[PDB]
Amino acid sequence: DAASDLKSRLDKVSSFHASFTQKVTDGSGAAVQEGQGDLWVKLPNLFNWHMTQPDESILVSDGKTLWFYNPFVEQATATWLKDATGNTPFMLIARNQSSDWQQYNIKQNGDDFVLTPKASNGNLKQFTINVGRDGTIHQFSAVEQDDQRSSYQLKSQQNGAVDAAKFTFTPPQGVTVDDQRKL
């Protein structure tokens, strides 16, 4: 079905670097903000998301810890990756538990998929993704409980264009870290 199709496409995703543009719109479709940046990904759960517009921010997952860095105020925060990603579509690619898929209703038309969490008490009300049969992700979007949607368009995807260093976070000089990880 659509779930097995999506999973088989996500299974073909391997490491890559891509540029992205972001469009955030509110419940009525009004423009909230636009942005752009770079994304580096390495299965099953590593990534470096670097926004340059409207503000510069970095999100790095080294597979265990999620680091968020805000260069503007020279501050970084660390939380466990499991905590930042639990109950999000991330789990659908980060592992392969049929249980995760049971949490969503899915609808497909070609490369377009819409995932709707079955629960009404969640972070996301809806998630969409456009990914080719070859595993190339073209776009995705997340709709928050506040009805606000954040849409992302990927371009210039280069498979293999990553290095281990991209998925590690070393706070630059002068940057203070608020480590929110309970040990």
Resolution (A): 1.9
Cα separation, 152 vs 127, whole angstroms: 11
Pairing of β 75-80 and β 176-179: parallel
Token pair of 156 as six digits? 């210039």
Cα separation, 109 vs 86, whole angstroms: 27
Q: Given strand 57-62, what is the order of strands in its sheet?
A: 104-109, 112-117, 124-131, 137-144, 149-159, 16-25, 31-42, 46-53, 57-62, 65-70, 75-80, 176-179
| Fold topology of 1-183 | outer membrane lipoprotein receptor (LolB), chain A (2.50.20)
Nearest to 144 by CA among 117, 120, 116, 125: 125
From which experimental method does this structure derive? X-ray
- The residue extents of the domains of the chain are 1-183
Nearest to 126 by CA among 27, 54, 31: 27
